Ligand binder design. Structure first.
Ligand SMILES: [Cl-]
Ligand SMILES: [Cl-]
Ligand SMILES: [Cl-]
Ligand SMILES: [Cl-]
Ligand SMILES: [Cl-]
Ligand SMILES: [Cl-]
Ligand SMILES: [Cl-]
Ligand SMILES: [Cl-]
Ligand SMILES: [Cl-]
Ligand SMILES: [Cl-]
Ligand SMILES: [Cl-]
Ligand SMILES: [Cl-]
Ligand SMILES: [Cl-]
Ligand SMILES: [Cl-]
Ligand SMILES: [K+]
Ligand SMILES: [Mg+2]
Ligand SMILES: [Mg+2]
Lengths: 239, 248, 204, 240, 230, 238, 238, 233
């Protein structure tokens, strides 16, 4: 069996394989999360468009369990492995504790899997970041992010993938009590954030919501393009 | 030892996986292979490279593989690598059947293989498999289906697509001709021959040079058939008759 | 005795350009009947069937594990398996468990897929094969079955006569066995068709 | 050399330089000699004293590998000591399996094949030591073998290893050792070490002496102190 | 343990160069030829047999695998012996399970699959040989080639080793589907004569045949006889 | 001439050297100095402890192995603990099996065997630590020294670590007095040797000196901080 | 091509751009490092092996200087090339033969022993982590059906039976000598003459070694000095 | 390219030296040991107002009597922290007593240098841990602060800073520290020093502080308790 040390330090304290994994994430499609008051929303760019594609087969938003879903940016094949590992873990947790996982619990599990792949012989790190959302037993909504290093944090809102830096800048100015006062504006805040980088803007954009107790609802190209037009014509007016 | 290791499963500075990419160049030079979904079936059509010589003709196809009762695939890339992967696909399908006593739904079979391909890009220090596949199938969850997988361990579902030589050109022609929700096996066959006619720069297209398999449903049973050369010639003739009415 | 826990009986019989295979239908646990439509004969080809009697769990396991191996065999090869080759495949499977065997003793009946020549065999639970030109029997009433087959079987029987003989051999044999019966199913295998019958039979 | 980083790589001239480089570590070491004679084998080692802070007897280069077999080494001392362990283990196992004392030739060959196994692979490096094995029994007579880092093993009348190997051999050749006793030969071993010792380049050495023969009843033993001192005195006055 | 990383990998243009270099070892090997007649198969090969000092009968290039299957190669001899041994073993494993001789195509698949492993598995190079495999089963003759990548092909006739390109066009203007085995042997030897150099004797070529009766090497005396005419 | 030969402990250089082993020995030369010496009846270790900053405790240098054996370390601390733990275990094993102390020279042999192994296998490295070993058994007091090369030495006295050359000179100068010394004299000699390793400005204090003693009537004992004061006053010098 | 090289094809056993294995080609060069030549010939009645015996020193116990080895009682061998590699290959051959006899109840044929050693060497030409052995083995024995046999295997894993053959520094010159002789339609005399020509020596009996098997006496036997001298003398008197 | 267990010509392991350079990129953490307890204080280093501050956790409880502050590559610290937790609980289980701070630190420190690519059991550790730790707690020796780095060297310190500004923070610590200093003084001192060294303007959400006292278990300061101590600025 193959035991080469793959992730090692370089002179100035860098772990280059981890940085390179982070470059893979940056070339992925943009993904955005916003934590509402009693909703949580995930939106993600494109994949491709491509008329001949079966839409169903390439979603970048994925249920891990009934009360937790995730989006990712980066290597899709790598993401599928992490997702499956997490799904297995959600069933062990229910098995041994007889509760659903918290969003933090499973975030922590994913993060530590990723960290291990940065310190174990024979393996490269995973080239993905994940936005993980849901609700805890007491109804508190949650948005967590992990990255290839195994670092994880909670966020009010965030973006990962290509154009994350400008999308994050947009969210910093635009995430306020007023922007998330209702479900519709929360959803629109995500779409506006994506329209900030998305190369065409219409569809393009896959979107999903999670309501307290209500489990994952994906939208809906007809319902999305309502919000798209409603934002496009507002961004014309301003000029 | 560290001196001789290729390091096939590591990232490059842009977050790339070079081997995977390089495998994808191997695929792009291999025989063109297309798949087309219709309302009443799915098909695979492939350029033959074992074509011809003093070759003997001993199997029912060159690059079309039956995977189980309800599924077939074609391949582009390294042939020996394709043999290992199609063998593994058959095993996965039989493991699933053994366990559940029902056929493996198409996407699940694709996924299972893609996890093996993925692993080869993340650990073990081995070269990846130099193969892309097209999968056709029927199951009770989504009916007629067509998938494509590549050495990255990525896959997707398609209504029509192409891999191997001149793929980009083949997909452009499919983008423009394919009628979402309205194709039949008979019109998909016509389109497949149209597409291979343009993308084979070995000039005069011939039945000895292509392979077509159809997958249909009859009396609650999946039927997978490699078309005989009589039928392939006949479709080539109809395509040639069809080119003009365009002219006056 | 492990082999009498579920009871049950199967036989196969050769005629002129045809074979027959039959089984009782009871699934029971010691004295208790549980069901009366339990499958013991499984298709292994268009013209090739395996019948398994013994412990019901292993009847199922062996049939499913054998099918796993056969499907792989047929996908990899050009072709439908030959009867004798199935026998050997089953022998090999059983003998792997030489020291913790499956408790089932199969009979195989079929026609060569190219030449249509009749074939019948049985194997013991560790995979010893036995090909015969007349009949084979397996189950809790093997003695009863042997009595009926030795007395009634004749060479060169046509499909109709083969059916009457295998039927009468089965019915009367299982009617002397407390833990076999609750119905009898018979398959007649010919070149151009399979004929499957259930028989009017005692239900005690 | 080009070509010289792994024992699993031949050079274009068919050499295994990593083995040659290991041989160079032996040839940087001070000199050890053995001499087989009428009734036994004697060993002597020029043992350089690198500090006056070391005890007499520190870093022995003469080992008992079985009750009847002595070992004399040159080269990297940690590698030699590990080889002394392999030899012990091999003699011990032989007694256990076959029920008698291992014959010297068979011990030499077994340990040589072990040395040899470390000259084929990138995974390990060759041993940086050469060693001599000596024994005596009424049945087999006196025997002296020498093994080098490549794993070659031969029997000898006289032998020397380390840095004044050639100078030593030429003195050893002057002796008619086939007709001499161990009691005579110790003196000549001391004499030869004093001749080849470069007193200008490396002041201070201990003479280490051991023997195995009729006179020790086939047991490999240190030469007694009084006899060593007489042999030193003989060597010294023979120089002056 | 061994080296666990592949020694064959993809180049930036998508080639597996170790395989292409293995093929160059095959191309520099001694010529081999196979012809599938209507009623059998012939395999023939040249001995790169220098010296009168060789005992020509002491090692054979044309080898039986089972009673009904035989092999020859072009390329590296010691590599070939590995594949002969494995092929024999594969054929016996099949026979123990199925109690029927291994169909030729099934044996080729399993051998080729071994050759594939040596293009990906850790710390090894590919085999520097191409095999020609002949056999008879289902009442019919088979000729296959298996190359260093593990790809295999069914041929009516072919050539491999030095001057194979010419050998194939020689066969291409000379094979017909209705041809008998005695004629095929003749044309196989003429194909080797195309690229020989030396004057042929029965001691420096080897010939094997496969038909309904089974696979066997021709004897020196039988080859001598065909060499009258040539 | 050098670079292709210095990264692997399995690569001999063209001079018959193994640069990895020589580089491991540099770890010991840069550790803080320690001195070991013995008389007829006692074995003593003396060590300078480094403190990282002013508010750090000084790094332990002297470690208990068994009642009759203690060690002073120089080099990689983590390697020093691994080796110490091996030594401890070999000593427990011998008391378990034989119900008597492991002779000191046998323990040292076991260290040589154990530390030699990774010097010959690819991808392993030498131990980056050197030890002075003080012990007392049936053959009397002992001072041994062990090295990253896996070689070891039986010593009348020794010093290793930074500027140990000075200490070694002192020890050679006075070693003919050691065998007859009483315990206080012998420790004073150790401290005088150690003090030679210091910059001219710097002095032995209760904060930087650690002492280890074993002998006929004394189990291996460590003296730190206020417990070194009896030995430091003392004070012969100037 | 023509002496092209890519990547690591001169360091490990991977194919060069012409399809060569340079490491294997270098192992043939290692055979000549020893500076010795060996010859073997077979007749209807016997097979003989002759090799040079160089004892420059004489502080050597010359009875331990041999390249002739008994593999079983009825199979002898001469080794040419690197010494330790050769001794290892002899050990392996002894193990293979003894193992064959244990499993199969009859002595290993010489052709089968040679083939087995050849197949073992083959592995070293295909697996990257070890080198080939730089040695060549010539085996002699009597086969009950085929008569005296001489077989040779090499570092490439090639092997063959021979009417006569050679190995080492003058192999090519020996091959020419033997070819020219074998072309016309005493085996010991041919062997020692071939060696003597190609080296230009005119031997003393202590400068060669000779081993034989005969149909009469299949046990491998090594000639004494006197027995060799009788052949040398009978030759000299033409 | 060289192996992970390669010594430099100065006698250091390259990978360990480089891991030590990674600690200089971490946020600053400070520990102070007083006769009334130990305090641990850490700069959070918030990179976006959208990040939740309470999800940055650089001070953790090991057991009731021991906390730990980390700096460097924080993901690497998890296995260390788990190990410390598991060990203290094992010790409790086996001996029915609390494990000393020194012993916990020793047990964690023995994982440092257990990396390599040849002996290697699992896919075992490929590299050292890019983390330094301060373990602060109270045992029968009284209050105690220990530092550990990626070399596996560990030592008791009266006061210690780690991470990017540690040179300067350490200087201010030598200045203000005294053996008789109270814990409240120590708290204030470490917040004054964090305030100087931090790039972000100090406040009650971008730092963390914890204590352990002979009286009282490991206690993380709340927003409100931090605000109180921040007033004196
Ligand atoms: Cl639950
Ligand atoms: Cl990102
Ligand atoms: Cl199926
Ligand atoms: Cl199974
Ligand atoms: Cl099977
Ligand atoms: Cl490896
Ligand atoms: Cl074989
Ligand atoms: Cl034959
Ligand atoms: Cl130190
Ligand atoms: Cl350290
Ligand atoms: Cl040393
Ligand atoms: Cl030092
Ligand atoms: Cl035997
Ligand atoms: Cl720091
Ligand atoms: K090799
Ligand atoms: Mg009944
Ligand atoms: Mg009843």
């Amino acid at each position: 069996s193959y035991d080469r040390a793959i992730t090692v330090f370089s002179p100035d304290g860098h772990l280059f394989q981890v940085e390179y994994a982070q470059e893979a994430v940056k070339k992925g499609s943009t993904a955005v999360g916003v934590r509402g008051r009693d909703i949580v929303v995930l939106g993600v760019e494109k994949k491709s468009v491509a008329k001949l594609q079966d839409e169903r087969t390439v979603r970048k938003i994925c249920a891990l369990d009934d009360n937790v879903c995730m989006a990712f940016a980066g290597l899709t094949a790598d993401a599928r492995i992490v997702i499956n590992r997490a799904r297995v873990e959600c069933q062990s947790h229910r098995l041994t504790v007889e509760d659903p996982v918290t969003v933090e619990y499973i975030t922590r599990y994913i993060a530590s899997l990723k960290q291990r792949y940065t310190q174990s012989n024979g393996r490269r790190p995973f080239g993905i970041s994940a936005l993980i959302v849901g609700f805890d037993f007491d109804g508190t909504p949650r948005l967590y992010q992990t990255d290839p290093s195994g670092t994880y944090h909670a966020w009010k809102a965030n973006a990962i993938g290509r154009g994350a830096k400008s999308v994050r800048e947009f969210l910093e100015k635009n995430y306020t009590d007023e922007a998330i006062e209702t479900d519709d504006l929360t959803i629109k805040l995500v779409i506006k954030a994506l329209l900030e980088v998305v190369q065409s803007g219409g569809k393009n954009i896959e979107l999903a919501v999670m309501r307290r107790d209500q489990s994952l609802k994906i939208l809906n190209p007809e319902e999305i393009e309502k919000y798209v037009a409603e934002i496009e014509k507002e961004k014309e007016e301003n000029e | 030892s560290r001196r001789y290791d290729s390091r096939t499963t590591i990232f490059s500075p842009e977050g790339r996986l070079y081997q995977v990419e390089y495998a994808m160049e191997a695929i792009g030079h291999a025989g063109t292979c297309l798949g087309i979904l219709a309302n009443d079936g799915v098909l695979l059509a492939a350029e033959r490279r074992n074509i011809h010589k003093l070759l003997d003709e001993v199997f029912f196809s060159e690059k079309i593989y039956k995977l189980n009762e309800d599924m077939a695939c074609s391949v582009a890339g390294i042939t020996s690598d394709a043999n290992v992967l199609t063998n593994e696909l058959r095993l996965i399908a039989q493991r699933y059947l053994l366990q559940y006593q029902e056929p493996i739904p198409c996407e699940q079979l694709v996924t299972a293989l893609c996890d093996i391909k993925q692993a080869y890009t993340q650990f073990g220090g081995k070269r990846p498999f130099g193969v892309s596949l097209l999968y056709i199938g029927w199951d009770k969850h989504y009916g007629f289906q067509l998938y494509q997988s590549d050495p990255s361990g990525n896959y997707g579902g398609w209504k029509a697509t192409c891999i191997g030589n001149n793929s980009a050109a083949a997909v452009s022609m499919l983008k423009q001709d394919y009628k979402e929700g309205e194709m039949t096996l008979k019109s998909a066959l016509a389109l497949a021959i149209k597409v291979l006619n343009k993308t084979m720069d070995v000039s005069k297209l011939s039945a000895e040079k292509v392979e077509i398999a159809t997958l249909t449903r009859e009396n609650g049973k999946t039927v997978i058939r490699v078309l005989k050369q009589k039928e392939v010639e006949q479709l080539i003739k109809k395509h040639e008759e069809e080119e003009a009415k365009a002219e006056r | 005795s492990i082999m009498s826990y579920n009871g049950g009986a199967v036989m196969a019989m050769k005629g002129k350009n045809c074979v027959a295979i039959a089984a009782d239908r009871r699934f029971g646990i010691q004295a208790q009947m549980v069901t009366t439509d339990f499958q013991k004969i499984f298709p292994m080809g268009d013209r090739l069937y395996i019948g398994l009697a013994g412990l019901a769990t292993d009847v199922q396991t062996v049939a499913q594990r054998l099918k796993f191996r056969l499907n792989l065999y047929e996908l990899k090869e050009g072709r439908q398996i030959k009867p004798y080759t199935l026998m050997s495949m089953v022998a090999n499977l059983l003998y792997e468990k030489r020291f913790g065997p499956y408790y089932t003793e199969p009979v195989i009946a079929g026609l060569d897929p190219k030449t249509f020549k009749p074939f019948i065999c049985s194997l013991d639970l560790i995979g010893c094969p036995m090909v015969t030109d007349d009949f084979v029997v397996s189950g809790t009433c093997a003695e009863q079955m042997y009595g009926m087959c030795e007395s009634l079987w004749e060479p060169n029987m046509d499909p109709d006569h083969l059916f009457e003989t295998i039927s009468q051999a089965m019915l009367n044999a299982v009617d002397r066995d407390a833990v076999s019966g609750m119905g009898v199913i018979v398959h007649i295998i010919e070149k151009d068709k399979i004929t499957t019958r259930t028989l009017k039979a005692r239900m005690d | 050399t080009g070509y010289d980083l792994s024992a699993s790589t031949f050079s274009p001239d068919g050499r295994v330089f990593q083995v040659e480089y290991a041989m160079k570590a032996v040839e940087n070491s001070s000199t050890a000699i053995g001499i087989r004679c009428k009734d036994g084998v004697v060993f002597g080692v020029e043992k350089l004293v690198l500090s006056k802070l070391y005890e007499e007897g520190s870093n022995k280069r003469l080992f008992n590998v079985d009750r009847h077999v002595g070992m004399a080494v040159a080269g990297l001392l940690a590698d030699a000591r590990s080889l002394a362990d392999i030899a012990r283990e091999e003699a011990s196992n032989f007694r256990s399996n076959f029920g008698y004392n291992i014959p010297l030739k068979h011990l030499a060959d077994r340990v040589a094949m072990y040395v040899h196994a470390y000259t084929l692979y990138s995974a390990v490096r060759p041993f940086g030591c050469s060693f001599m094995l000596g024994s005596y029994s009424v049945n087999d007579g006196a025997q002296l073998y020498m093994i080098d880092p490549s794993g070659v093993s031969y029997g000898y009348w006289g032998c020397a290893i380390g840095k004044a190997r050639q100078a030593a051999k030429t003195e050893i050749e002057k002796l008619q050792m086939k007709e001499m006793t161990c009691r005579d030969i110790v003196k000549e071993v001391a004499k030869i070490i004093y001749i080849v010792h470069d007193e200008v380049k490396d002041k201070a050495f201990e003479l280490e002496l051991s023997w195995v023969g009729e006179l020790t009843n086939g047991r490999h033993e240190i030469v007694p102190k009084d006899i060593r001192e007489e042999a030193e005195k003989y060597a010294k006055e023979s120089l002056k | 343990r061994g080296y666990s990383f592949s020694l064959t990998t993809f180049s930036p243009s998508g080639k597996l160069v170790q395989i292409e270099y293995a093929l160059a070892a095959v191309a520099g090997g001694a010529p081999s030829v196979g012809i599938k007649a209507a009623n059998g198969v012939v395999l023939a090969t040249e001995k790169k047999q220098k010296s009168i000092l060789y005992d020509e009968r002491s090692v054979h290039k044309v080898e039986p695998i089972t009673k009904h299957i035989g092999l020859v190669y072009s390329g590296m001899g010691p590599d070939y012996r590995v594949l002969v041994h494995r092929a024999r073993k594969l054929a016996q494993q099949y026979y123990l399970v199925y109690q029927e001789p291994i169909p030729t195509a099934q044996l080729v698949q399993r051998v080729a699959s071994v050759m594939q492993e040596y293009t990906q598995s850790g710390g090894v190079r590919p085999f520097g040989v191409s095999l020609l495999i002949c056999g008879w089963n289902e009442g019919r003759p088979y000729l296959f080639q298996s190359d260093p990548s593990g790809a295999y092909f069914a041929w009516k006739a072919t050539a491999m080793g030095k001057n194979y390109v010419n050998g194939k066009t020689f066969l291409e203007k000379r094979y017909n589907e209705d041809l008998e085995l005695e004629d095929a042997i003749h044309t196989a030897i003429l194909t080797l004569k195309e690229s020989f150099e030396g004057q042929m004797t029965e001691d420096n070529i080897e010939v094997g045949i496969c038909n309904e009766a089974g696979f066997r090497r021709l004897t020196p005396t039988e080859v001598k006889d065909y060499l009258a005419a040539i | 001439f050098r670079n292709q030969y210095d990264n692997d402990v399995t690569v001999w250089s063209p001079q018959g050297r193994i640069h990895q082993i020589e580089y491991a020995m540099e770890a010991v030369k840069q550790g803080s100095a320690t001195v070991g010496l013995k008389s007829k009846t006692h074995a003593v270790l003396v060590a300078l402890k480094r403190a990282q900053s002013e508010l750090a405790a000084h790094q332990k240098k002297i470690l208990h192995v068994d009642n009759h054996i203690g060690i002073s370390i120089a080099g990689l601390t983590a390697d020093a603990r691994l080796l110490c733990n091996f030594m401890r275990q070999e000593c427990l094993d011998s008391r378990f099996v034989f119900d008597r102390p492991l002779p000191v020279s046998r323990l040292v042999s076991l260290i040589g065997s154990k530390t030699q192994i990774p010097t010959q296998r690819y991808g392993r490295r030498p131990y980056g630590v050197g030890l002075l070993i003080a012990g007392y058994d049936d053959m009397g007091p002992h001072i041994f020294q062990t090295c990253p090369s896996a070689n070891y030495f039986d010593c009348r006295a020794m010093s290793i670590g930074a500027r140990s050359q000075s200490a070694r000179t002192y020890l050679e100068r006075h070693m003919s007095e050691f065998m007859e010394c009483n315990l206080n004299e012998l420790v004073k000699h150790g401290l005088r040797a150690l003090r030679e390793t210091l910059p001219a400005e710097q002095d032995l204090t209760t904060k930087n000196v650690s002492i280890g003693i074993v002998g006929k009537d004394l189990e291996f004992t460590i003296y730190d901080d206020d417990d070194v004061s009896p030995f430091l006053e003392g004070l012969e010098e100037r | 091509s023509r002496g092209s090289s890519a990547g690591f094809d001169r360091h490990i056993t991977i194919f060069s751009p012409e399809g060569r294995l340079y490491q294997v080609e270098y192992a043939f060069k290692a055979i000549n490092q020893g500076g010795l030549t060996s010859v073997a010939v077979r007749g209807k009645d016997c097979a003989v092996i002759v090799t040079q015996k160089k004892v420059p020193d004489k502080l050597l116990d010359s009875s331990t200087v041999t390249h002739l080895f008994k593999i079983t009682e009825n199979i002898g061998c001469v080794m040419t090339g690197m010494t330790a590699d050769s001794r290892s290959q002899v050990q392996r051959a002894r193990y293979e033969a003894a193992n064959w006899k244990y499993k199969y109840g009859y002595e290993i044929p010489v052709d089968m022993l040679c083939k087995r050693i050849a197949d073992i060497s083959q592995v070293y030409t295909q697996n990257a982590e070890m080198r080939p052995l730089g040695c060549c083995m010539i085996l002699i024995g009597i086969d009950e059906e085929q008569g005296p046999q001489v077989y040779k295997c090499d570092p490439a894993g090639y092997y063959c039976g021979f009417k006569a053959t050679a190995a080492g520094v003058k192999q090519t010159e020996s091959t020419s000598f033997l070819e020219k002789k074998v072309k016309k339609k005493q085996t010991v005399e041919t062997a020692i003459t071939c060696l003597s020509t190609v080296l230009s020596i005119d031997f003393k009996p202590s400068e060669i070694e000779v081993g034989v098997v005969t149909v009469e006496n299949p046990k491998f036997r090594i000639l004494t000095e006197a027995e060799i001298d009788a052949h040398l003398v009978a030759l000299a008197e033409r | 390219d060289r192996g992970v267990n390669t010594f430099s010509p100065e006698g250091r392991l390259f990978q360990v030296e480089y891991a030590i350079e990674a600690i200089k990129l971490g946020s600053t953490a400070i520990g102070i040991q007083t006769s009334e307890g130990v305090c641990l204080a850490v700069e959070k280093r918030i990179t976006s107002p959208l990040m939740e501050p309470s999800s940055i956790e650089k001070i953790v409880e090991i057991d009731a009597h021991i906390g730990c502050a980390m700096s460097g590559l924080i993901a690497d610290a998890k296995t260390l922290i788990d190990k410390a937790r598991v060990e203290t609980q094992n010790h409790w289980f086996t001996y029915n007593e609390t494990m000393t701070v020194e012993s916990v630190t020793q047990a964690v420190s023995n994982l440092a240098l257990q990396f390599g690519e040849e002996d290697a059991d699992p896919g075992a550790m490929s590299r050292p841990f890019g983390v330094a730790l301060l373990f602060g707690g109270v045992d029968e020796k009284g209050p105690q602060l220990f530092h550990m780095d990626p070399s596996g060297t560990f030592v008791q310190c009266d006061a210690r800073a780690i991470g990017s500004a540690s040179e300067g923070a350490q200087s201010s610590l030598q200045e203000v520290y005294h053996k008789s200093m109270t814990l409240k003084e120590a708290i204030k001192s470490s917040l004054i020093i964090l305030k100087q060294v931090m790039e972000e303007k100090l406040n009650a959400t971008n730092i963390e502080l914890a204590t352990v006292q002979p009286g009282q278990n490991f206690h993380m300061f709340t927003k409100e308790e931090l605000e109180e101590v921040i007033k004196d600025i």
